[PDB]
Amino acid sequence: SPLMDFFHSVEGRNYGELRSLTNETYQISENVRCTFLSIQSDPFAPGSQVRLVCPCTFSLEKVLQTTDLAAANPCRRVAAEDFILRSFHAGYRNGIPRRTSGAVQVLRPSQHVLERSTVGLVKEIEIFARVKLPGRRIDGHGAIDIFYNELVPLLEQCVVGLNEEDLHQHVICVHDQEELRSNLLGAGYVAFVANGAILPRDAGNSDKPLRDNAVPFQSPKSLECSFTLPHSGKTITGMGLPPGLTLIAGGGFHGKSTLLRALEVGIYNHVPDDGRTYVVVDPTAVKIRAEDRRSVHGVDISPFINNLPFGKTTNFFVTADASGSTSQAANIMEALELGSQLLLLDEDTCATNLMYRDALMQMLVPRAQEPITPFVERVADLSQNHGVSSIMVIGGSGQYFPQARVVLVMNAYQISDCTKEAKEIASNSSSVFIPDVNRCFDPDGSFTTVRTKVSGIGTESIRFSEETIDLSMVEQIVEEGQVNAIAQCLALLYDGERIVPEMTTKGGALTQLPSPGGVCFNSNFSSMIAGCCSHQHDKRLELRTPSCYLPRGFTSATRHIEIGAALNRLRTLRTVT
Amino acid sequence: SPLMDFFHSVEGRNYGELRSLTNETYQISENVRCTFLSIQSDPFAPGSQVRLVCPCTFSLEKVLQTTDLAAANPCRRVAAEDFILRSFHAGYRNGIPRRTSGAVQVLRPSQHVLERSTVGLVKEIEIFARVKLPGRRIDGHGAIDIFYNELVPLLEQCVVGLNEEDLHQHVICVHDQEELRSNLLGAGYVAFVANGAILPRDAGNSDKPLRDNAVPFQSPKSLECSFTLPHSGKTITGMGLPPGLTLIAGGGFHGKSTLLRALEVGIYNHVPDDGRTYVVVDPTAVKIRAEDRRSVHGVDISPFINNLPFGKTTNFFVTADASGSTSQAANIMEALELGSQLLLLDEDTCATNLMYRDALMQMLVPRAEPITPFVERVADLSQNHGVSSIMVIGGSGQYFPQARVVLVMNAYQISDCTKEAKEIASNSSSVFIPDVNRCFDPDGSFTTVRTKVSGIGTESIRFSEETIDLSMVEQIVEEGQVNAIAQCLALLYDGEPRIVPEMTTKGGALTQLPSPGGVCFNSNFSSMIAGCCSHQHDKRLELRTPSCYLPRGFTSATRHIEIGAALNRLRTLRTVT
Ligand SMILES: Nc1ncnc2c1ncn2[C@@H]1O[C@H](COP(=O)(O)OP(=O)(O)NP(=O)(O)O)[C@@H](O)[C@H]1O
Ligand SMILES: Nc1ncnc2c1ncn2[C@@H]1O[C@H](COP(=O)(O)OP(=O)(O)NP(=O)(O)O)[C@@H](O)[C@H]1O
Ligand SMILES: [Mg+2]
Ligand SMILES: [Mg+2]
Ligand SMILES: [Mg+2]
């Protein structure tokens, strides 16, 4: 009631008047309360941050399995908050807002279920928003619409008026997914692909499942295996993949890349639509690709590449313009340093030189003269002595056959288990890694340059003061709120110049890190980044550290490996050993 | 004079009266004049478009070799306007402006010399700009600063007060530079790389040459050749590449991607620093890569990929989400139909399946294997259609029997090893229709649109609600180029009915297209795109087709092939045969 009357009150009057609202809290409905987090300078300044608060109607016991909030499995708290976001957002598609100024920015959820700062379940329901409040004169009627006519009905009908059965099933599917990824290394696998999974996406620029003429994934028998889901009781069946080397071989339009992308997202749980639901991978899995002109600092790529020009150091690599082989190797070590157990390779984004060696090529120029020691030679070593496994798509090269654990053959989106035939083909055709990695972070040479503000640019980049970090090929980033999280971390690392050691220890301390779902090889770089991640988790995916330029509640969880990767490619980065 | 005397008058007054400034044209100095092409609505709005006019002081005789404007070689006209802007911009680093509002937006030219609408030479000098005229009570003093203090000294000192000896030398390098490529197909070559060239760049995110410890290009003797530049008299020497197949072989970190990138830009002339200056390629050459999830419509990918799943037609291919080989082959023909003469490949960003087939792969599963690799179509394409290929190969000597020359690179030093290489092979040892039927269908193509077309940086096109991915069309090298493409799309759309057949004709008529420097296999698609390019050229890089959201003078020339690639991968592209 009173907010409106207030606005009538200030309806004509000048814009400055608005700075009164901030902090000033009003109840706009019986079941809705509004709290003002900021009030911006003008209409065109991006949003005026507000906290929408409304009662939590559903039974915790039925959906969260406990009466007291604090006991609830965080996974289910996430799936809940995730769901509410989804429901509120769908409210626009169901013509619920009697009016749609469209000046209401609230973070849009991916197809993946991540903890987001956006909705918090507290004891109530906490939804953060950004609103473009309506000439120089104020125009209260605009706002008046915006709250009473657009937000209240959406809240009351899609948020307060939730559907419990839907909620409960959301949460059950999600949780069963987490648990099912928690069962992986135990059950004997590194990846599991559920039967009937609709892997292929809707469009090359789309993440939703394929509506038309999808072919449900079917595991070969020899690779078939089953599980029991705890919360649904549903028992499911599919393709299990042992530790070691999984080869995905077929030449054509067959589905190879499509399966693999499923596996990269395999570290996520997605809304029951997604159709990749219950395709799961080790939660530390990393899409490994050549990436070029990326900068490297302090990575020891010496396992793969041996003989740089001009006696330049393999063992502590450093460039601001990297090669396809060198940076791919850079990414493999970058990864191991952050502790990945399952590398994911799509050969078409991989640096052929790294991958294998041609006879003609070696005889043309002697391999003594060639630096590179290809991946095939390091792979058996990595699985046997390190428990690091690889799944990779190979297009037309059987060189990997003596090393291959399984050889898959994809044809028109159908798989066959051809591991026997292939190693038979191989047949008739016939460690090196330091886990304790000496890499500390140097905030001095790293941050000397800058002049600030830190902010996430879409899904692609980080505005880091005058600097700009390119994540366009950190392919497992799948939300804007993720890169935003990363921005929070960077602005933190920057702001407190006690923290590197402090976070390094904060990290060495931990036994398990948070998955982006909420559920819980070393070095000081690694461990530090773990410290940052962990601290961020602590403060509810919202560090506020001063140099950060971010709205309240547009942040999504992300693995520590991603914060790793983002710093890892700061091109002002400096690092010591 | 009069402008400021106006402004203070206004300075209390409301922003609106700035709508008086429209059209009204003022002289803020002897050698300066400004014309207001627009006025922003708001202080925020991206700026207010103005024409900056100043006298042409230099002797046209020495620089353009004619007293009369209209005779001037457009190559030297471009190099002129290029140089003018460049100095103007340099005016900021030389402490020239008295004040620095930074409300002045004027296109930043790249290292490339391109025709740009920004500076025009007419009879004088024409520079287009965008200004943010500053509380929302007018900031008359602020504006006064922008013009009396910032723009004028820049103009008078760096533009009116230009340096003719440099400008002359600019133009000589540029012109001599264009001529050197015109000489290429004649002199018997497809690529020429000048000795002493500095190929590599300062940083993975930078286009400027490698300042520190660059190693100068040197041609192997066997491939060495020389030319004579008409305008400088200078005689230059380097690496000549014949028609046919050139293989770039090597190990790692030796500079192949460096050389190749130089060759991709080889369709451009660079400001005399750039250091790739006098590296030239066929001005039609295209960087061919696997581009995944790109949409295809109407491409006959048949020569490489003869089979698909489900009787899907290779001969008229269509996907909204695409494969590495499938996309790459689309690219090869997309480019062929637009008339490429040299295909440029980095075996790394190429889809390997398209490139060779392993013995082991072929046996494990027989080829009766959609794909027919490039190695087989290469001789054919060369011999029968005069389309050549230079490609970086990482470790596969399979191409050796097909190889014209085999280049071996080692620590930034090339060697001719084609003898030894083909021996290696010896020791271990048409299809394409030029007449491709592809008409453009504006009906199905433009149905879903409500508009506005605007280029997003260098990377994408906001085509109404649609978005086009130019992120892997690697030879786009300016924002003004993407803006150009946006102009053309806005044209095909707004002038929809008669513009397709008309441009098709307007393009069949043409025996030469305009190179981006200004100097001057068929299908209706192609001929149409050529029509668009040529009409754009005619119209001075300013087609204000009505649905174009663009400031005046933020446009740069492109090849026709580029406009081809953008339309080509529109996700609502419908095309008929
Ligand atoms: N199981 C499926 N059902 C329906 N469509 C599919 C399926 N799998 C893949 N697709 C579509 O097939 C197209 C090509 O599949 P893709 O995943 O690229 O095969 P691929 O092996 O990567 N070929 P390549 O990378 O060229 O060697 C993509 O558009 C997919 O969306
Ligand atoms: N003339 C030069 N002077 C100095 N540095 C150079 C020169 N040419 C190349 N480089 C460096 O080498 C890198 C490019 O070479 P690169 O692409 O690694 O060769 P490559 O071995 O063919 N690639 P790959 O085989 O895929 O690893 C750049 O990052 C440059 O820094
Ligand atoms: Mg390279
Ligand atoms: Mg390379
Ligand atoms: Mg693919």
Numbering used by the authors:
A (entry chain A): 52 to 174, 185 to 195, 198 to 493, 505 to 525, 533 to 578, 580 to 602, 609 to 665
B (entry chain B): 52 to 174, 185 to 195, 198 to 431, 433 to 493, 505 to 525, 533 to 602, 609 to 665
Task: Give the text the authors published on this PDB structure.
To gain more insight into nucleotide binding by MRB1590, we obtained the structure of a MRB1590–AMP–PNP complex. Clear electron density was observed for the AMP–PNP molecule in this structure. The MRB1590–AMP–PNP structure harbors the same overall subunit and dimer conformation as the ADP bound form and AMP–PNP binds in the same pocket as ADP. In the MRB1590 structures the phosphate moieties of the bound nucleotides are complexed by the backbone atoms of the Walker A motif while Asp411 from the Walker B motif interacts with a magnesium ion. In the MRB1590 structure, this signature motif corresponds to residues 385’ to 389’ (where prime indicates other subunit in the dimer), and contains the sequence, ASGGS. In MRB1590, this signature motif contacts the AMP-PNP γ phosphate and hence, as in other ATPase ABC proteins, it is predicted to be important in ATP binding and hydrolysis. The structure of MRB1590 bound to AMP-PNP predicts that the small residues in the signature motif, in particular Ser386, would be essential for the close approach and binding of the γ phosphate moiety and that substitution of the serine to a larger residue would prevent AMP-PNP binding. To test this structure-based prediction, we mutated Ser386 to glutamate and measured adenine nucleotide binding by this mutant via ITC. These experiments showed that MRB1590(S386E) bound ADP with a similar affinity as the wild type, but was unable to bind AMP-PNP, consistent with our structural data. Strikingly, our structures suggest that ATP binding would favor the closed state, in which the RNA binding cleft is largely blocked at the bottom edge by Phe95–Phe95’ and Arg199–Ag199’ stacking interactions. Given the fact that the functions of ATPase proteins, such as MRB1590, are affected by binding different adenine nucleotides, we also carried out RNA binding experiments with MRB1590 in the presence of AMP-PNP. These studies showed that MRB1590–AMP–PNP bound RNA poorly compared to the complex with ADP.
